[PDB]
Protein: Speckle-type POZ protein
Amino acid sequence: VKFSYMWTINNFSFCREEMGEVIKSSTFSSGANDKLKWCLRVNPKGLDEESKDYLSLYLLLVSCPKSEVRAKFKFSILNAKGEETKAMESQRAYRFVQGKDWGFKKFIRRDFLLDEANGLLPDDKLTLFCEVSVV
Amino acid sequence: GPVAESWCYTQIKVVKFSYMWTINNFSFCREEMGEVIKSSTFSSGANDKLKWCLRVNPKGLDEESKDYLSLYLLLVSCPKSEVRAKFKFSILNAKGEETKAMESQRAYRFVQGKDWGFKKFIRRDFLLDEANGLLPDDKLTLFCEVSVVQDSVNISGQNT
Amino acid sequence: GPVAESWCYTQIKVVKFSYMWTINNFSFCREEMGEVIKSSTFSSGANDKLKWCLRVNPKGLDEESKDYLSLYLLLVSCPKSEVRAKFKFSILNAKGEETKAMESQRAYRFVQGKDWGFKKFIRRDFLLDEANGLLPDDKLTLFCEVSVVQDSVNISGQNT
Amino acid sequence: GPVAESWCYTQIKVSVNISGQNT
Amino acid sequence: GPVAESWCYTQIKVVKFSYMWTINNFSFCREEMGEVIKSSTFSSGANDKLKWCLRVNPKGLDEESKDYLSLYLLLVSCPKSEVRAKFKFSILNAKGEETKAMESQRAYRFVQGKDWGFKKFIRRDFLLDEANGLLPDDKLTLFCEVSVVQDSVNISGQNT
Amino acid sequence: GPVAESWCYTQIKVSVNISGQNT
Amino acid sequence: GPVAESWCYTQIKVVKFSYMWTINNFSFCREEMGEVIKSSTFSSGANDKLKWCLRVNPKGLDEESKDYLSLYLLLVSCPKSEVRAKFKFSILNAKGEETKAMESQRAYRFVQGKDWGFKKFIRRDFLLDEANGLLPDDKLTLFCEVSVVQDSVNISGQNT
Amino acid sequence: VKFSYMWTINNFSFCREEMGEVIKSSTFSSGANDKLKWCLRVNPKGLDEESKDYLSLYLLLVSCPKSEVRAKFKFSILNAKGEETKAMESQRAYRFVQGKDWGFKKFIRRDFLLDEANGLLPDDKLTLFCEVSVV
Structure:
């Protein structure tokens, strides 16, 4: 049950909004069972002031038939060349409930992302690759 | 970057206005501080219901400014409620390249009759000096570029 | 060299009148303190209903200015309620160059029968001395130019 | 030597204005 | 008492929703950190599309709120692009009086599926202590008041 | 004793929402 | 007072507009720095060609005015090129009388879309506290009295 | 040839302009010869910078049959009661030509005029009384 998701945000420097806002994604699934719907809820700004200067990336289970879903999610960012970079993996099998989000608040420094020498923001477009394994 | 069974493409639509605004015989500004030389309204082809103008005070707008040029941008007509935009002003030089370019980092909100600008735009003595040549033949040329951000749209394409 | 989708142009209209006023046998000033020698009214073709005149006091306007010849510009006829102008007085020496040319930094507001000029214009002793050459053949050749400013108009261009 | 569009030759007898005008 | 020829009245309309949410058998919260107990969606009869709900975490969001019961307000359904509201959460005691009432001074911008609330709403040990009386019969009663602000209109009643 | 317009009685067995809204 | 043979009664015509503005639930001003809440256009019966409006920023205009209410007067339309007027703003109390009334001694030139007002009109904490009674029932009533001066006219009556 | 002139300005506090301008009167004369025309010129603020806080007042000869005219002028202010107060004259017989202004720049302090206790500005109306005698 290895889901995958390559979601792209263009003209990202025009982030359009202030502190603590969300950029919701399209609900994605696999062909089977197609009854489990997930969406990446990214915040281009920090989610909290406790750890600001961060691209807090979350995974939310929007639709589910069962009471709970045990899933391991892994986010990553593609560079200009396109390999997997900043691959951050959640080690536990997190429990998911109807309308529940888990993810990495301290995902990546915004200052680290904003340098052009890193190549992590090519053509003002960022590509998030998320893999979800359901057990 | 492996193959994704599903992908998305969020498009935060942006539109760009480009404006040149020329004042001849600028030394004959003819009035004291607080005066405003309004500019003719300008827009793009789309949506063309949004009308912007440049408001410039040849002298300082505030008591702290005095010897300062202040350049503002005003939205005179809006079909929506509010419009968020980033504006960048730059005084063109005698040869023609952009000098003294100062931009607003935040996407400022805009309503009808609401203006945003830089009171501390350029030193007035810097502007009036002949050596740097920001006022060639008593002409002041301001180039203003406005980027208006729109709502995001997701196309939601699912792969094999 | 940026390219602007919309361009504007604001032109502030300035009209320049010039006047060369010579007074023969000036040393016979014929009167003491308080004398005003008026000049014949002058104007250009446009708009030809703005009539100005020059008014000089050869001795001086007031007791601070006994040794200071004072020259004044008087707007005798004007159609509008308010006229704004900037004046420059000068004196032509024996050769013909301008000498002691002093200008107005501000654009003063003029009205019917209002005078704005430099009371502290020129030393009397500097004028009468022959080695200075400012009084050739006893003829004081004053020379004035006034730039009157009008309200600006926006051309309001647009390109595509 | 600057030029003007209007003249005024005020002559004081030993005061009238000739007021010649350049055209 | 000054009589004015012209009057005006700018009325900003506030819509107030109120919510009483009781959770019986609270001590058997059945889950550790991270658990969210959603409430049934509630609304008032003002266009009946602004549906709100309350999300409580009986343990807390994170390690800074281990002993802090968080309580969030979530706007599930809304007609407009954004809604501006100010919310107040309180707890009822055995006598029914409000206790531990706290509110957000700002008017927060709400959107489709956005939660604005107090992570450090109440001490856990304060709540479970029986002498405090905040948990009568293992039932946690929460009171919520939401005031939605909308765009104002002008009446402008001209006076004789 | 404050009064509310909408109620919700969540019961946990030994979790369903009654939502006894005031009519 | 002996009887003069000739007299001249000069009338500098002045007109007076009075304005009362009421804002209900003012604490729900709903926006931060820079927000302008305009007022309905007001005028007198004669000549009814001069159209003004009030404008207030609840938080303030500039960094000097964080804790300062700012009230401004704006001439939204006028057929003449310029209008000179003196404006006086005041805030009524709970009992209804004037409080913290402060006025402008100088008459400012007004033009199409020009504002003149007091950025530091009243301290925000002074207004927001309950003891002074300056915000009764969350209502802020502003009384604006403006006086427009006109050109003088001489009747020139002659006696025996 | 003793003229007289009661030249009144109402709502004077709404003085309509800043320092350095003139409120011109209408031309006046006597029945005989009715050819010599005079007019007062009063500057509500100071005429010149050192005057500033001053109410300068002048007499101007607009129309004259002869070349040069000798005249003694005396200005005064009529108070709330109506008597002649702050009356000071020009002892010298001043000489007048076509469009010549003679008078007092230092005629009265603006601040001394502006007290309500003095009564020199009743009902925002000021009453200049000018008496000029031609010899």
Remarks:
- Chain G has one helix and nine strands.
- The radius of gyration of chain G is 20 Å.
- The interface with chain B takes residues 34, 36, 38, 62, 111, 113-114, 116 of chain G (CB under 8 Å).
